[PDB]
Amino acid sequence: DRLLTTRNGHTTSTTQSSVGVTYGYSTEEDHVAGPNTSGLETRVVQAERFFKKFLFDWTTDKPFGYLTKLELPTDHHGVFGHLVDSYAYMRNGWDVEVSAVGNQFNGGCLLVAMVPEWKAFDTREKYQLTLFPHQFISPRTNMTAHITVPYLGVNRYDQYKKHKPWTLVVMVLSPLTVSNTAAPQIKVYANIAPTYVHVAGELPSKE
Amino acid sequence: GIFPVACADGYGGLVTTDPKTADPVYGKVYNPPKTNYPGRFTNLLDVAEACPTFLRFDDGKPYVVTRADDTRLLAKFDVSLAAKHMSNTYLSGIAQYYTQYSGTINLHFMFTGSTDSKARYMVAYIPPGVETPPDTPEEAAHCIHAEWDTGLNSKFTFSIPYVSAADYAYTASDTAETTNVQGWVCVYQITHGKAENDTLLVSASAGKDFELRLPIDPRTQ
Amino acid sequence: GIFPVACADGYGGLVTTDPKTADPVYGKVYNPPKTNYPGRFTNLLDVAEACPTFLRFDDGKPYVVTRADDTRLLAKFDVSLAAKHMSNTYLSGIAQYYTQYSGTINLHFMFTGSTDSKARYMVAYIPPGVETPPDTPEEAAHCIHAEWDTGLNSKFTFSIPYVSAADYAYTASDTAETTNVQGWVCVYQITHGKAENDTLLVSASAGKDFELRLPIDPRTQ
Amino acid sequence: TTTTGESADPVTTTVENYGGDTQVQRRHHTDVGFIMDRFVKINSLSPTHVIDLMQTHKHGIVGALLRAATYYFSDLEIVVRHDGNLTWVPNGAPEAALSNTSNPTAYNKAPFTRLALPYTAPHRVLATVYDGTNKYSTQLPASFNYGAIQAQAIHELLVRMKRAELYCPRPLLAIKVTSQDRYKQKIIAPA
Amino acid sequence: TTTTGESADPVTTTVENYGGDTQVQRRHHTDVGFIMDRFVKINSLSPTHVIDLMQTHKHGIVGALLRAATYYFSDLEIVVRHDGNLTWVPNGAPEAALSNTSNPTAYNKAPFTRLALPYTAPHRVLATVYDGTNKYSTQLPASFNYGAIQAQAIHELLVRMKRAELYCPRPLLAIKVTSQDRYKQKIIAPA
Amino acid sequence: SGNTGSIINNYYMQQYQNSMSTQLGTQNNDWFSKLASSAFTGLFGALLA
């Protein structure tokens, strides 16, 4: 029983096949109160909760190297999204959980990693994608991957509408294998939650 | 024998801002005493703080006039030391010699009206991120802002906060820069009573944490 | 008089890797604080140890597939940072910038099979001295080797020992080099049950005593 | 040693597992600060040049290594072989300033000019890659530079990272191998 | 904060008024002594030149800054690129003295000559502007100088204010703006 | 000092390197420093936070 239940605000998620959580680059957050915000930043806890996003269909035909990515933050239709439209500057980290649920009779292996400052990777570079915070998902072992990362970047605060620091990436390491008893394919979903949300610079009304 | 020494290539050239001193040639001169001479200043910002100077509006006046019509936006300008409105201030005069800055810039509004002229104003800092500054107090109200009315006290001071991604900002503006990188300041007139034609003088000064770094000689010579 | 000094011939030229420092010209700049910035690394090998990366096999896959036929040699490769199979690893990425090395290189095997796919593998280090690596587990058994089976734990790690005459070895391979100077690594498949088409991911990382010396800039520019 | 590979938890086995002795190692040469601390040539040049460490060659020891990190920080040293006097200007300066002498200007002295320059950007740290959707009003922000230099002509430019700090490592590749087993090349040997 | 503007008493509000935190500042770069302490070029030259800091360019960092003060004081350093030997003479000397060698004369040594000179005027301090109704028996008193120099030819003259002291600040102007909002100009950026 | 950063002591005596200042009686005569430090910082009136 590798039973883990994560909580973010009024939302919870529990897995019975976890392999732990991978913390990336740091285990804490840098100082969220720097000179660049004067004293005007504030924390908006109502945004620290899970939202969902479909990633892709893990099918037998997708080979090693097949890669799907999701640049964060992404389109949000909740309070987080409203924040992005109401404040000039924000910062937050991410608590990511990804599911690739098929069954024990499937085979293959996915690599899920959080990458800072994305750039399309050369196929040779894919062999070294493990230098980034990551975790694997292999049907014989687990159905969930969980990574937690801090905010980072050259600016203590950002303008998400112009730059996306983190970008989630899931890639086929070994192709999915199916048998008569396995799931025919595996839909991969993401359950993400922003952490330590801070905003600064109240923008005007659009009216 | 004598001391071996390697004269290194790459070193020794004169550099206009070097940290050395020349060799002297005319020694023993005692200057006339200048003890306690008045008006000395040792840091530009000390004066930049103590002596506020005027912004430039419209025709080229250091003030804003109360609108008699239905428009409430008295004035609007880029939060930039290179702003047109800031072009005559001592603050910008200094700023041109530095590459970057950070800190608070303070604005001062001084009503010039008659004893029977009354008004209520509002100043707001519109951070960057919006396409165009709001021409309405109602829309601007959602920003960091302050309102104040006319009375016994003629001056009202407001601090424009430093809020940006980077810790510092450029004092200059690049030609590719469409919208001002640091946002705008909007001054509105909520209302007035018999205040037509009366004036509002606005000036600016450095705040307690205003800072300029990286000296630069940019003017055409 | 003044201090006599001999300016020595042979000294003073600039050398791209010299241990001196230039004379400064623009003083007193205080940087924005970067206290506690995440993900810092101070020695390449710290990451080379913590982050293993993948070997390249066959078509160009980071894994080996279980043979359904009667051949048991899953893979074989030169123990060389210049090995073809090692060409995509971060370890080799670093190694190219150094002339020599010594130490343990660790290999990691991670079974990707289904819960009902079972297998037993064997890895062996064939030191130099033989003409060709054995294609049989039986022959390889006489070398330093390890066997392990499939189960609850997917990963199995093995250390390739540093065994050579000299204390160090070249990271590069000379063209005259026929047989790999440091030997080979052979991965065998003892057996498997319903494991056809299943995969074995193999990666590599630096060991506790892995060491690189003598920086070098060898790539064509 | 078997482990749960999926967790991505680091595992470093040692030769002791089968009877060996792990030895002593000395990793001075792989120290980041040390390794990046040498001069590297900048190939593209022009009478007015804006110092950008990314103009460094991508396979050069410094360039490759720099690119194997997402964020960095350092002071700098430069060596410039130029005609006429050399004028440097800090990050953020109007190009026009380069013409003025009161900005650090080094008067020509043969054979070249070696200088010590400070990090002068407005960010807490710089990046080698920047995923800007825009970053405006493989393009990196204009602010990512070490100032600019100008002279009647600029023949050579060597750059040296002092006090380097690297963060968030990313892919570092070796020469791709076509040869069946190893990449073989002529290694120096006495004649 | 409201106040009685008319009194001209200084008022410095802070962002705390509406919930902010005033930060830390470091004003080394705006220190008078430091800022005026760099070389500046003197454009008009002639085989016999009387050193006058006002010949400095009015928009140059040093010139502009100097002119933004009514009274000043400083020692001086000069760099002169000349043909033949250079002779300097203190404030108050008959022009004829420049021909004599026993006055500080620096024998030609390539590429130029760098010297350290003392304030040598007879006044407790000098001025950048002097409202003389006459001042005789935009013209500044003859006594407002740092001596004179002469050589067969004088190609360049750089001057450096040491130990500067500025008093009674006066107007310092920026480039006038014609553009609707800001003065925009090409700022250095990597290519 | 301002823009001078030599660790080593000067080779020439002070009375040659610079002119000697005299007095008739540096001090904290910094009108502008005093002036700026004397600026009203508070808030005139009653507050309701």
Add this chain to the structure above:
Amino acid sequence: SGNTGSIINNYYMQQYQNSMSTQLGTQNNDWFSKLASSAFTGLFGALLA
């Protein structure tokens, strides 16, 4: 330091030779060092030597 081996102290003050780093509170912030030192070294399971 790295690749600097001068026995003698520098002639120019530190504030000129280098930029001054500031803080808002070097340290043992070496994620990767920690990471590498945390690697499992043992052997999972029972041993029979």
